[PDB]
Design a protein around this nucleic acid. Structure first.
Length: 49
DNA sequence: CGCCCTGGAGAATCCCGGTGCCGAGGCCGCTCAATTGGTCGTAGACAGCTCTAGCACCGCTTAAACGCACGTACGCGCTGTCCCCCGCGTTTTAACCGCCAAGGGGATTACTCCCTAGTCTCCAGGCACGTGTCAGATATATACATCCTGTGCA
């Protein structure tokens, strides 16, 4: 993940990113820094709580 | 034939932004032991006087300190050996959350009696002190006890 995040910030290396549900719990501090346009949730019956 | 010195390579570090996050401090409400004064009685500093071991000293009387000479043997330097834990990759488990919500007992706060001991008081007696007495260690008569000497002998 560090190797994925070293081409991350300054330029645009991707038009979309694929991140698992549970990884945003640990990496929430890193993912909250970058601005985003669309964040979509699959099978929302998880987050329902 | 194989080793210091150089050069290429790699990665670990330092430092400078860049944005989200939370408790340090400020602000208020409040509220209780510090502050001020008076009363009261009480131990500490000031002599006072005394008395007693520390101080400085002098001179026998040994007795450790010292200087040195020898020495020998273990601390140390060097060398060969080998093996054991570090570095790294691959396997395996501990712990967090999600589900899906309930109580539970133990220190806290507040209240409530109740009785053990501080304080005061007087009566008595007991252990620090002075003296009696024996234990141990000390210094000296003493009855033989071992050389020395007249001394008489064969």
């Amino acid at each position: 993940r560090k190797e994925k995040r070293k081409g991350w910030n300054k330029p645009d290396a991707f038009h979309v990113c694929i991140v698992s549900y549970q990884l945003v719990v640990q990496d929430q501090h890193s993912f909250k820094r970058k601005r985003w346009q669309y964040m979509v949730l699959d099978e929302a019956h998880n987050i329902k709580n």
